[PDB]
Amino acid sequence: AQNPNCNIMIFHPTKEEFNDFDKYIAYMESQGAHRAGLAKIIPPKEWKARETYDNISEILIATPLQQVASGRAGVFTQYHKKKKAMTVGEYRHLANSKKYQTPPHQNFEDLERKYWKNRIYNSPIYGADISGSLFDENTKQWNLGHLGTIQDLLEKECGVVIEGVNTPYLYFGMWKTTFAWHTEDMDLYSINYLHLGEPKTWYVVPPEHGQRLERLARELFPGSSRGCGAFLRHKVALISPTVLKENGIPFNRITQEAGEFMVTFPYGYHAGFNHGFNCAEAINFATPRWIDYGKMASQCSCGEARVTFSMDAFVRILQPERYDLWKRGQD
Ligand SMILES: O=C(O)CNC(=O)C(=O)O
Ligand SMILES: [Mg+2]
Ligand code: NI
Ligand SMILES: [Zn+2]
């Protein structure tokens, strides 16, 4: 069995290997990359996402979200307070302001220490989940706006035609902006490209151990757990690496830099934070190996999680027994 310790692997495809996306994901899994829950893909040196980022300031962040924490430094929740719209240019200025800028630090490890010590005492502002793409239309390889759709995959594998579309999202981050412990909708894969700016640190639990994380989460967030049997789907809970280690939860960590892709694999719980002003693009996708995960994905039916139009058909076809209760949660 490849990669039995579930380490995060880093891949360096050649330009030729970068042509066929599906093939390369299949290659990565042949070498055991999925066991980690997360992989890093460094594009060939010949490749570019687009010519420059000089013209992005007029993009609008319609609903910036201020991320307010409650709890203790290593175990906390966050809620998203809606703020007034601003442009990417206005947002970058805010990120670079004294109130929000990255502090002086020695290296990534120092900055990680400062993040876990001090995150709860600030409320950074995140531009998340903005429908759109920064890939040039002429970029033919690993263009996140031109991937095969999840609906087509399900069609190809299972023969059923379904409604729905699948498009990318832009994330504009600053220091301390945070992504809570989660798996993807329907335990899908995700792919994330860091277009520009400061790094993003990731933490990930191997899919084969995700239930160990869930059991700890229920212990650490007991009221949340009583309200919903899948409350990690709410995407509000944070647990530090120090707390994971104290409770024996297997996990790994890696920092993503500008120009790099990260792939998250089905049922790979992940969480993380941004180092300073950045812009990432991400999209869910599927492979044939996903189908089994999709059939077994937990669902939030308490009403909090509230998700895209396109998840209806996934639940309807893969999880018909759950469908009625889950849709009541949606409505
Ligand atoms: O970048 C972020 O804030 C969150 N991204 C993801 O969780 C992902 O790509 O799966
Ligand atoms: Mg612009
Ligand atoms: Ni994710
Ligand atoms: Zn719920």
Instruction: Give the C-alpha separation, 115 to 121, whole Å.
Output: 10
Ligand 1 close to Cβ of residue 204 (< 6 A): no
User: ∠ at Cα 94 (91, 98), nearest 5°?
Assistant: 160
**Residues whose CB is less than 8 angstroms from the CB of residue 297 and which lie 6 or more positions away in sequence, other chains included:** 183, 185, 186, 187, 267, 318, 319
In this structure, which ligand is nearest to the CA of 127?
A: 1
Q: Between helices 311-318 and 320-330, what is the axis angle to 10°?
A: 150
Ligand 2 centroid, distance to 97 Cα (angstroms): 21
Identify any residues that bridge with 261 across adjacent strands, giving them in sequence order.
41, 193
Q: Read out DSSP for 8-45? A: PEEE---TTTTS-HHHHHHHHHHTTGGGTSEEEEPPPT
**Residues whose CB is less than 8 angstroms from the CB of residue 182 and which lie 6 or more positions away in sequence, other chains included:** 232, 233, 235, 269, 270, 271
CA atoms within 13 A on the CB side of 306: 3
Tell which residue, 293, 294, 314, 289, has the closest CA to residue 25: 289
158 is in an annotated binding site: no
Q: Are 280 and 194 in contact (CB under 8 A)?
A: yes
> Residue 30, exposed/middle/buried by CB under 10 A (0-12, 13-18, 19+)?
exposed
Supply 181's token pair: 């412990």
| Ligand 1 atom nearest to 173, measured from its CA | 3
126 is in an annotated binding site: yes
Ligand 1 close to Cβ of residue 284 (< 6 A): no
Experimental method: X-ray
Q: Which residues does the chain break after (C to N > 2.5 Å)?
A: none
Q: For the domain that residue 92 is a member of, what is the CATH number?
A: 2.60.120.650
For ion ligand 4, residues whose CB falls within 5 Å: 228, 300, 302, 304
Mutate to test the pocket of ligand 1, among 130, 176, 177, 179 (most ligand atoms within 8 A of CB): 179
Q: What is the count of structural domains for the chain?
A: 1
Q: Between helices 150-158 and 311-318, what is the axis angle to 10°?
A: 20
Ligand 1 close to Cβ of residue 202 (< 6 A): no
Instruction: Give the C-alpha separation, 128 to 126, whole Å.
Output: 6
Residue of the nearest CA to atom 7 in ligand 1? 179
User: ∠ at Cα 268 (67, 222), nearest 5°?
Assistant: 55
Q: Using the 8-state DSSP alphabet, how is residue 311 labeled?
A: H
300 is in an annotated binding site: yes
Instruction: Give the C-alpha separation, 154 to 159, whole Å.
Output: 7
Tell which residue, 41, 169, 176, 168, has the closest CA to residue 105: 176
Provide the b/e sequence for 103-129 (b: ≥16 CB within 10 Å). Answer: eeeeeeeebbebbbeebbeeebbbbbe
In this structure, which ligand is nearest to the CA of 305?
A: 4
Ligand 1 close to Cβ of residue 179 (< 6 A): yes
Its domain, for residue 212, covers 1-331
